[PDB]
Amino acid sequence: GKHVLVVYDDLSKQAAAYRELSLLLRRPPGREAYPGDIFYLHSRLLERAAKLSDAKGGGSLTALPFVETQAGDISAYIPTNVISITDGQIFLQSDLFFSGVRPAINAGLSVSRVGGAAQIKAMKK
Amino acid sequence: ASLRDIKTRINATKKTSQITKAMEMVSTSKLNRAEQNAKSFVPYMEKIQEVVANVAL
Amino acid sequence: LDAKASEHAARMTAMKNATDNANELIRTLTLSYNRARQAAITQEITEIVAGANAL
């Protein structure tokens, strides 16, 4: 019945370690040498965060996975895989970071499908 | 630089180029409209010019 | 009236040469993008070939 918040600091490093293990076990490689179940791994991990019904106790678990990109490329394999799973994404940019705009949330690109319901009435107004 | 950054730079420069071309067209129209007044005004200036050159001295 | 028409001519030529400069930069940048992408294409081909060979 409690409420829990979980932060995963680098799913990209997790995926790199899993790719290392798969290559050492000589499983067939996909794109960027990643194995075929790399999306299955992360989906199985992330889907365990949930909001339980009042019959089950009313507890909840919320997750904040992290992904580190290179040169701002958000079309890469792991970034796309994680983007397609989560309810919403928050984009941070060094362009905004060094122009004085920190925290560097790019509100134009960031999305949240659970918006409105996750806000009090005054905040919505 | 990354392809993502190159795409943004190219798109922004397209948009600026479109703005500049549109404003070039608007300036051209205003120039073609102003030339008519510029050529029309001459008779009135020349009348006063000849009359004053004759009488004022 | 002469000054107004001069303003029109000046702005027209400024917009014209600005458009010319912008299109030159676009030519350069787009061609740069196109030289860059072939490296990614050959890299992914190399990766596929190596993955097929190593097995």
Side-chain angles (χ1 to χ4, degrees), chain A residues 39-85:
Chain A
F39 177 93
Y40 181 37
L41 174 71
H42 283 160
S43 60
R44 198 169 73 251
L45 165 66
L46 282 175
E47 282 284 287
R48 289 166 77 172
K51 174 67 167 91
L52 293 185
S53 59
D54 295 270
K56 296 299 299 286
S60 74
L61 193 142
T62 183
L64 301 181
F66 283 34
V67 169
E68 191 186 90
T69 57
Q70 290 101 26
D73 190 6
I74 58 154
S75 76
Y77 195 28
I78 308 303
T80 52
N81 286 350
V82 184
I83 279 169
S84 78
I85 297 164

Side-chain angles (χ1 to χ4, degrees), chain A residues 3-74:
Chain A
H3 298 286
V4 188
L5 163 67
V6 187
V7 176
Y8 310 110
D9 186 74
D10 265 326
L11 294 196
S12 50
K13 313 262 201 62
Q14 177 187 4
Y18 189 61
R19 180 186 65 179
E20 167 184 346
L21 290 169
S22 301
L23 287 173
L24 287 176
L25 283 175
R26 291 188 151 273
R27 295 179 178 190
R31 57 179 289 186
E32 315 179 49
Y34 286 103
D37 63 323
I38 194 67
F39 177 93
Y40 181 37
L41 174 71
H42 283 160
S43 60
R44 198 169 73 251
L45 165 66
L46 282 175
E47 282 284 287
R48 289 166 77 172
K51 174 67 167 91
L52 293 185
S53 59
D54 295 270
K56 296 299 299 286
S60 74
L61 193 142
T62 183
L64 301 181
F66 283 34
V67 169
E68 191 186 90
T69 57
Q70 290 101 26
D73 190 6
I74 58 154

Side-chain angles (χ1 to χ4, degrees), chain B residues 23-53:
Chain B
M23 293 318 217
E24 197 192 338
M25 294 299 291
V26 177
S27 71
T28 298
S29 176
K30 286 179 176 192
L31 182 147
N32 278 282
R33 174 231 61 91
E35 286 180 349
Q36 311 182 37
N37 274 126
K39 64 178 71 66
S40 177
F41 157 79
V42 168
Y44 284 107
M45 201 295 288
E46 295 281 70
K47 180 198 59 170
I48 308 285
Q49 177 57 252
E50 64 174 0
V51 182
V52 73

